Amino acid sequence: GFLELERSSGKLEWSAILQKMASDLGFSKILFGLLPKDSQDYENAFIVGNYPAAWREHYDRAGYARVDPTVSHCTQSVLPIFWEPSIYQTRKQHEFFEEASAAGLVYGLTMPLHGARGELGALSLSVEAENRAEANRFMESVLPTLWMLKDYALQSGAGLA
């Protein structure tokens, strides 16, 4: 439910709930990340979820925030960007893709977060599918629910980053 999210007290409880709503919706890995107004400090964003630790580490250390095409997207758009070959346009972005894939992030989307007080962030979710046609079918069945979720997550989570 969306209400357990808003009425949850701490960071552990809130992120636990967001993460179970995400698995219950059928997503495997989740990242919620949020920055205050006018910050581009991606190495110091509020970040919760279940991305493997080694991958989050590589990401920060290699400076992927500057490369990751979903980052520049969130900056200019409120619409989701699905993780497709298309979005990986330069060749550093291709390297980025072969690494994410090796870390298990192949099918998925990133929902941009733009808060009432100027917050900037992203909710990203992975899908385990035997392929991208099954993965889109799945995504298309959950989108409206997810779209609501990302907003409840931003409103309630903004008050604790």
Where does this chain touch ligand TY4 (CB under 6 A) — which range of 2-10, 17-25, 119-127, 133-141?
A: 119-127
Stretch that binds a second copy, among 56-64, 81-89, 100-108, 145-153 (CB under 8 A): 145-153
Separation CA 30–CA 121 (nearest Å): 13
151 binds a second copy (CB under 8 A): yes
142 lines the binding site for ligand TY4 (CB under 6 A): no
Q: Which stretch binds ligand TY4 (CB under 6 A): 10-18, 30-38, 129-137, 146-154?
A: 30-38
Contacting a second copy within 104-133 (CB under 8 A)? 112, 114-118
Nearer to a second copy, 106 or 161 (CB): 161
Cβ neighbours of 10 (radius 10 Å): 9
Total chain residues near ligand TY4 (CB under 6 A): 25
By CB under 8 A, residue 78 contacts a second copy: yes
Q: Write the burial class of residue 158 (CB in 10 Å: 0-12 exposed, 13-18 middle, 19+ buried).
A: middle
Span between the terminal Cα atoms of the chain, in Å: 21
Binding partner at 115 among ligand TY4, a second copy, none, C-beta below 5 to 8 Å by kind: a second copy
Token reading at 62 = 């290699």
Concatenating the DSSP letter of every residue in 55-97 gives HHHHHHHHTGGGT-HHHHHHHH-SS-EE--GGG--SHHHHHHH
Binder of ligand TY4 out of 15, 83, 119, 154 (CB under 6 A): 83
Residue 87 CA to residue 69 CA, distance in Å, equals: 6
